[PDB]
Design a protein around this ligand. Structure first.
Ligand SMILES: [Ca+2]
Length: 240
């Protein structure tokens, strides 16, 4: 996250870290949101490569023990049917990881609340992005979890010519673009948490940023819109 601040350790409990095995070490690649004790929601481009993945919940500092972590392997990866790697502007950037074991829910491991189906936010709605991704465009990952206030840019303003044009679709939520704060690589797959009726709900799955950079005036972070996927999600969880 470019432009944020350290989250408190109990703040975002549904946030998970998605890591892959590199040699005999383990490295952070993406975020995710715990939605069942055995299912994580993440971006599809995160699990494109044929890597061994593991999920860390209740994680806060990547390099130190926090005394709150739970590590569990991924037994099945279910990507949207229509996802195409050569086109992230096409959408369907969402995937479901069933965990090899169920995690224990406590003050650090809680489930993400998803939006009702079809729910669109009013423009400039208060949302926070969270994650361990880059803190500078072309910089390096953060060790502690970062958060940043990112208000939505609605689909009309966002598909207009000064913002994202035709690159963005209505299956996606835009947030930010002040050119100071934003998501960045390592944040993908992670949550966009939007306050709605006194509760925070996970409305976005971080998907992408501009090739120019992460924080760029009028190039908000593009998230996959979760409220467009509730029925697909639920059809997958009730099978496996
Ligand atoms: Ca740790």
């Amino acid at each position: 996250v470019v432009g944020g601040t350290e989250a408190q350790r109990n703040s975002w409990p549904s946030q998970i870290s998605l890591q892959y095995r590199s040699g005999s070490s383990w490295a952070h690649t993406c975020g995710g949101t715990l939605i069942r004790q055995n299912w994580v929601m993440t971006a599809a481009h995160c699990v494109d490569r044929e890597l061994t993945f593991r999920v860390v919940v209740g994680e806060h500092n990547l390099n130190q023990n926090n005394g709150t972590e739970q590590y569990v392997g991924v037994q099945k990866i279910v990507v949207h049917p229509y996802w195409n790697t050569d086109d992230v502007a096409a959408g369907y950037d969402i995937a479901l990881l069933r965990l090899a074991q169920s995690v224990t829910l406590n003050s650090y491991v809680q489930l993400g609340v998803l939006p009702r189906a079809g729910t669109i936010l009013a423009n400039n709605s208060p949302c926070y992005i969270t994650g361990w991704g880059l803190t500078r465009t072309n910089g390096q990952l953060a060790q502690t979890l970062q958060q940043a206030y990112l208000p939505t840019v609605d689909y009309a303003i966002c598909s207009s010519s000064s913002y994202w044009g035709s690159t963005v679709k209505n299956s996606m939520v835009c947030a930010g673009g002040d050119g100071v704060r934003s998501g960045c690589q390592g944040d993908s797959g992670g949550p966009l948490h939007c306050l709605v009726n006194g509760q925070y709900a996970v409305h976005g799955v971080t998907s992408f940023v501009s090739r120019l950079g992460c924080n760029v005036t009028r190039k908000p972070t593009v998230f996959t819109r979760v409220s467009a996927y509730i029925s697909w999600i639920n059809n997958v969880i009730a099978s496996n």
